[PDB]
Ligand SMILES: CCCCCCCCCCCCCC(=O)O
C-alpha cells in the first residue's frame with residue numbers, strides 16, 4: 001500500500017534512550033545505534049511481512065492485522081505483539097512482563113516514519129525508498 005517497498009534508514013533520533021528504556025545492554029546498544037537497516041514490507045492477502053536486514057542482525061515478522069502473535073525481537077525479548085491499522089498508521093504494540101512498547105509506522109510524503117515509545121522516551125526513525 002503506502003507501506004510496501006524496500007526502505008533504508010536515513011535518520012534516527014533518541015534510539016539509544018529508547019533501547020536503554022527497553023533494558024538493552026551497552027554492547028547491544030552500541031551495535032544497534034549505528035546500524036542503518038533496510039526494512040522490506042510486503043503484503044500477500046491477509047498477511048503482512050516486515051523484514052529488517054542489517055549487517056549484524058536480521059529479523060522478520062509475518063502477521064495478520066488484529067491477531068496477536070509471539071515475536072522474538074532484535075534484542076531477544078519474547079513478546080506478544082499485535083498490529084492494527086489506525087487512520088493509515090500501522091500501530092504495533094509489544095507486551096512482555098507487564099510492560100509495553102508501541103511502534104507506529106506511517107507514510108509521510110516520500111518517507112516511512114517510525115515512532116517508538118517506551119515509558120517517557122520517544123524515538124523517531126525515518127526511512128527512504130532504496
Ligand atoms: C543486535 C542488535 C539489536 C538492535 C536493538 C534493537 C532493539 C529493538 C527496537 C527495534 C525498534 C524498531 C524500529 C524500526 O523499525 O526502525
Ligand SMILES: Nc1cc2ccccc2cn1
Pocket residue numbers: 031032033035036037052053054057058059074
Ligand atoms: N533486525 C533488526 C536489526 C536492527 C538493527 C539496528 C536497529 C534496529 C534493528 C531492528 N531489527
